[PDB]
Amino acid sequence: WTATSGSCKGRCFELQEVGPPDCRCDNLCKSYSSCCHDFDELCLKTARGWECTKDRCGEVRNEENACHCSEDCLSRGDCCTNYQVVCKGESHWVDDDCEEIKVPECPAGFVRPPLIIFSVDGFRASYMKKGSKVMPNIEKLRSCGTHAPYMRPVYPTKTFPNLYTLATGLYPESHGIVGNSMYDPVFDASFHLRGREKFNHRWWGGQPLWITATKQGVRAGTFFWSVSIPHERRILTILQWLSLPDNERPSVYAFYSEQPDFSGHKYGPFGPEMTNPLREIDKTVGQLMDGLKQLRLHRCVNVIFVGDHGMEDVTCDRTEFLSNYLTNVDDITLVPGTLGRIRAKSINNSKYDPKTIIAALTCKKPDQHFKPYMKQHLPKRLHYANNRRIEDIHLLVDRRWHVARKPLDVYKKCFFQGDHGFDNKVNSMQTVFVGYGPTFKYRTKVPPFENIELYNVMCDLLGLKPAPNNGTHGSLNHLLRTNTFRPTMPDEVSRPNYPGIMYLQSEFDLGCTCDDKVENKLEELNKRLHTKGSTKERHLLYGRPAVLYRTSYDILYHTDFESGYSEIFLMPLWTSYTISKQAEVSSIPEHLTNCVRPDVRVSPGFSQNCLAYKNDKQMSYGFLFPPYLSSSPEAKYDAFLVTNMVPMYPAFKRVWAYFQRVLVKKYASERNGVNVISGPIFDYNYDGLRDTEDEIKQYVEGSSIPVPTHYYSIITSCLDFTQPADKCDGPLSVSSFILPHRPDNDESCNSSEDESKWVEELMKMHTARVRDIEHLTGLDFYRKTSRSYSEILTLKTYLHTYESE
Numbered sequence: 001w002t003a004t005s006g007s008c009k010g011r012c013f014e015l016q017e018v019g020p021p022d023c024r025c026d027n028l029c030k031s032y033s034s035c036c037h038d039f040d041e042l043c044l045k046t047a048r049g050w051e052c053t054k055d056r057c058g059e060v061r062n063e064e065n066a067c068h069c070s071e072d073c074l075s076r077g078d079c080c081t082n083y084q085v086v087c088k089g090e091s092h093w094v095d096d097d098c099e100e101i102k103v104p105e106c107p108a109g110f111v112r113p114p115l116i117i118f119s120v121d122g123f124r125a126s127y128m129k130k131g132s133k134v135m136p137n138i139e140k141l142r143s144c145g146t147h148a149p150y151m152r153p154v155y156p157t158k159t160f161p162n163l164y165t166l167a168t169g170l171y172p173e174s175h176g177i178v179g180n181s182m183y184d185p186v187f188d189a190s191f192h193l194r195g196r197e198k199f200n201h202r203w204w205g206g207q208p209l210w211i212t213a214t215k216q217g218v219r220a221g222t223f224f225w226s227v228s229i230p231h232e233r234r235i236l237t238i239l240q241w242l243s244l245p246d247n248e249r250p251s252v253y254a255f256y257s258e259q260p261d262f263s264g265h266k267y268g269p270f271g272p273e274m275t276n277p278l279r280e281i282d283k284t285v286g287q288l289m290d291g292l293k294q295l296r297l298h299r300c301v302n303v304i305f306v307g308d309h310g311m312e313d314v315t316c317d318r319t320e321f322l323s324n325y326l327t328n329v330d331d332i333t334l335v336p337g338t339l340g341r342i343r344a345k346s347i348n349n350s351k352y353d354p355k356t357i358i359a360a361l362t363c364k365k366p367d368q369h370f371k372p373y374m375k376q377h378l379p380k381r382l383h384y385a386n387n388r389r390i391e392d393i394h395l396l397v398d399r400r401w402h403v404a405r406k407p408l409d410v411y412k413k414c415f416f417q418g419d420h421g422f423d424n425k426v427n428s429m430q431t432v433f434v435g436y437g438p439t440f441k442y443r444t445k446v447p448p449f450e451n452i453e454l455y456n457v458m459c460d461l462l463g464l465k466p467a468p469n470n471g472t473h474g475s476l477n478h479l480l481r482t483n484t485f486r487p488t489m490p491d492e493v494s495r496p497n498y499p500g501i502m503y504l505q506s507e508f509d510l511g512c513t514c515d516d517k518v519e520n521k522l523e524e525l526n527k528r529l530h531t532k533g534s535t536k537e538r539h540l541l542y543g544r545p546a547v548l549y550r551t552s553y554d555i556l557y558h559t560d561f562e563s564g565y566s567e568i569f570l571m572p573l574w575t576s577y578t579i580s581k582q583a584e585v586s587s588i589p590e591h592l593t594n595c596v597r598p599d600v601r602v603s604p605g606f607s608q609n610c611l612a613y614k615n616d617k618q619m620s621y622g623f624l625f626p627p628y629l630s631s632s633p634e635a636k637y638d639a640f641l642v643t644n645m646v647p648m649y650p651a652f653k654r655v656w657a658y659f660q661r662v663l664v665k666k667y668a669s670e671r672n673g674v675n676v677i678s679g680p681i682f683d684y685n686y687d688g689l690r691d692t693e694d695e696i697k698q699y700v701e702g703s704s705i706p707v708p709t710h711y712y713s714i715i716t717s718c719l720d721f722t723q724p725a726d727k728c729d730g731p732l733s734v735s736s737f738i739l740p741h742r743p744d745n746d747e748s749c750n751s752s753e754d755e756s757k758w759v760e761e762l763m764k765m766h767t768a769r770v771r772d773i774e775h776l777t778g779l780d781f782y783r784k785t786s787r788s789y790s791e792i793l794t795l796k797t798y799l800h801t802y803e804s805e
């Protein structure tokens with residue numbers, strides 16, 4: 001109930017929202033059906049439209065007009081945005097030459113430059129180039145300010161998860177808005193695009209920017225606008241708020257546009273119909289800029305022009321139906337479209353089985369346009385699992401396609417030509433970023449980055465301390481002229497032991513054997529030097545990784561590789577080695593096929609054993625430093641140490657062996673040498689964070705050898721590839737992956753073919769940032785480089801995406 005009999009007189013677009021049953025006058029009252037009876041008459045004036053004309057110049061103020069051209073309008077703060085152009089001979093902002101804003105130029109009483117976020121739904125990255133002729137205002141912000149060629153959204157590439165990630169710095173799994181449609185089984189409640197449920201605050205986790213600001217004494221405009229409030233009225237409202245007295249005036253504001261998304265669904269991303277919406281959004285930007293210029297704020301405000309996601313060509317004929325795969329299609333609920341989420345239709349159905357559903361959906365039709373996953377098996381880069389609102393069964397849908405339950409869903413709900421939601425590395429889903437103002441850099445291009453990083457920057461722009469979030473604060477310092485955030489490297493928590501030779505061979509009863517019994521002072525001193533770290537500068541190029549948690553571990557040196565060996569997990573946390581362009585690949589000699597060697601530096605008690613692998617009929621083993629890349633036949637024996645062994649399913653060893661024997665040398669050849677750091681990951685609760693020992697669900701049978709859920713590699717070389725990886729003077733180049741350690745290759749439909757036809761495709765899908773690996777391992781990389789720390793932070797956030805340009 002609302003008492004709509006109150007009045008909006010003197011309250012239009014009030015900032016503080018009044019609670020029921022009092023009627024409301026704020027920019028959301030329409031969404032709640034709660035506006036005072038006179039809200040339209042008073043607050044949504046339209047008379048005479050949105051622009052001054054020469055005949056209105058100097059008019060007698062008529063309060064009924066949408067905006068004013070009378071002499072008093074600048075002091076009232078309610079001129080039409082083109083007032084000074086039409087009436088006072090001024091130029092439009094877009095017609096002015098770009099001039100560097102070295103310092104804020106603000107009116108008296110402004111304590112800080114305001115921030116205005118201009119957000120655009122479905123604004124695909126390539127519109128910046130393809131629409132450039134029809135977007136002069138946006139093209140000027142872009143060329144004069146700081147811009148990226150694109151910004152990467154979060155998965156799923158839907159509106160509510162992306163806008164709320166922009167606002168929070170959080171992955172959807174952490175903020176809770178994991179789709180545009182959701183069921184929360186604890187609440188027993190459903191969230192929908194349409195309806196009242198989505199207004200309940202219990203869906204919305206983390207701390208969005210407007211709350212961060214308010215809590216720290218920075219006033220915020222409201223970030224949401226009822227759909228029926230026209231864009232011209234939104235801009236005029238922002239400009240009116242900016243004319244409030246200093247103690248009342250917000251410092252941060254958001255504008256939102258439903259375009260070009262709304263038309264892009266109807267017409268596809270590049271339909272001829274799309275030129276007009278792009279022109280219209282450009283005109284709205286021009287109104288804002290002209291309006292700021294009238295207020296003398298155009299060299300004071302920082303403006304961010306940012307999108308939520310792009311838009312792909314998708315038609316009703318490109319739909320896969322689960323009714324063509326499942327016998328039991330009426331026993332499941334499907335969240336459908338550009339992703340799939342599957343759960344039981346009834347929690348009382350004891351004959352529901354996820355294993356049979358997954359098997360029925362796996363590589364069943366030659367050109368199948370979706371792939372099923374249990375959510376914990378999704379690429380870790382998507383960070384899409386650790387929330388009860390995310391169904392265990394997930395379908396990753398190919399770009400340009402939909403999935404639906406039955407054909408009748410598609411025609412009893414072609415219509416649309418565009419959609420979005422796909423994998424966030426897909427080129428058509430990429431969106432835009434431009435920052436313009438005194439605090440941003442002048443005429444500066446920055447590399448692509450993820451939208452989770454922006455919250456920290458928006459906090460820096462406002463002098464706010466960000467709430468804990470998933471950005472890496474300092475990674476976007478290169479966008480900023482001032483207000484940079486200068487973090488210190490984390491302190492190492494555990495210091496390594498450096499064991500010498502402490503055990504005789506016969507102390508070990510590991511059930512291992514090696515044919516290594518062949519017996520020179522010219523080389524005996526040499527072998528000692530290698531075990532003491534004489535080659536470590538070659539193989540550990542960026543310092544040792546720091547261990548950021550409490551544990552017991554040893555540094556182990558070898559001719560060809562260095563490792564940090566965990567006495568707790570019985571295997572390396574990390575193994576580091578460098579492969580030059582000139583390195584040669586060799587085979588594992590026949591007599592060494594099954595060779596495993598005790599390490600006399602490490603006690604039998606803290607070592608793996610071969611008998612456990614013999615007894616465990618599902619589990620085999622591989623090596624972190626590859627025996628294929630040994631520098632000499634003698635150095636090769638080090639690669640078979642029990643301290644370089646890790647547990648591996650046979651199906652996984654197909655993947656790992658091809659990576660180590662073929663791909664490492666291919667990358668060294670292409671990149672002029674590479675440095676590789678590889679190791680295990682344990683994430684059994686799929687939270688993106690390193691497991692403690694008590695979270696491990698699987699061990700090698702009969703032993704305390706824990707089974708990794710994933711294996712990582714970080715592959716670093718010189719960005720200037722004229723220099724070899726081990727003699728690099730300037731910036732670095734990285735690619736990394738987090739491969740799932742699975743007992744089958746059911747993910748790769750072409751796996752019965754030679755590894756050359758499917759392994760690199762799998763690895764590309766599981767590409768990762770260094771920062772993802774840091775979370776998963778509790779390690780901190782790149783501690784000793786010649787590079788600035790902010791530059792290293794940017795490197796650690798890099799994702800190699802393997803999309804075309």
Ligand SMILES: *[C@@H]1O[C@H](CO)[C@@H](O[C@@H]2O[C@H](CO)[C@@H](O[C@@H]3O[C@H](CO[C@H]4O[C@H](CO)[C@@H](O)[C@H](O[C@H]5O[C@H](CO)[C@@H](O)[C@H](O)[C@@H]5O[C@H]5O[C@H](CO)[C@@H](O)[C@H](O)[C@@H]5O)[C@@H]4O)[C@@H](O)[C@H](O[C@H]4O[C@H](CO)[C@@H](O)[C@H](O)[C@@H]4O[C@H]4O[C@H](CO)[C@@H](O)[C@H](O)[C@@H]4O)[C@@H]3O)[C@H](O)[C@H]2NC(C)=O)[C@H](O)[C@H]1NC(C)=O
Pocket residue numbers: 170171173174175176202203204205206383386387388468469470687688689775
């Ligand atoms: C991305 O960045 C984010 C933000 O930094 C990272 O997420 C943080 O990770 C921390 C570790 O996982 C986590 O810290 C925990 O906080 C618990 C209290 O949590 C509440 O309070 C905070 C602060 O206001 C709030 O933010 C939380 O919000 C969550 O929950 C509500 C649901 O009510 C949601 O609306 C909201 O969206 C958010 O959900 C997300 O996180 C929760 C977990 O908190 C997930 O379950 C959801 O799926 C979703 O992803 C909360 O309202 C605190 O209780 C924890 O302490 C436990 O563990 C420690 C061990 O050290 C121990 O000392 C305690 O005893 C306690 O254990 C007890 O409880 C156990 C479980 O019930 C039980 O088994 C034991 O026996 C014990 O009794 C813990 O410190 C922090 O909450 C989140 N924050 C957010 C916003 O998500 C995220 O990791 C980053 N991601 C990556 C990849 O880096």
Ligand SMILES: Cn1c(=O)n(Cc2ccc(F)cc2)c2cnc(Cl)nc21
Pocket residue numbers: 117119159160161163164166167223224225254255256306
């Ligand atoms: C889900 N969601 C949000 O979090 N915001 C606020 C917001 C966040 C980031 C931003 F850059 C601008 C505005 C929204 C505004 N409008 C709509 Cl239809 N949905 C929204």
Ligand SMILES: [Ca+2]
Pocket residue numbers: 682683684685686687688689690691
């Ligand atoms: Ca974990």
Ligand SMILES: [Cl-]
Pocket residue numbers: 156158178179180181335
């Ligand atoms: Cl969804």
Ligand SMILES: [K+]
Pocket residue numbers: 613614615616617618619620
């Ligand atoms: K075995």
Ligand code: NA
Pocket residue numbers: 745746747748749750751752
């Ligand atoms: Na397969």
Ligand SMILES: [Zn+2]
Pocket residue numbers: 122159261262265420
């Ligand atoms: Zn859309």
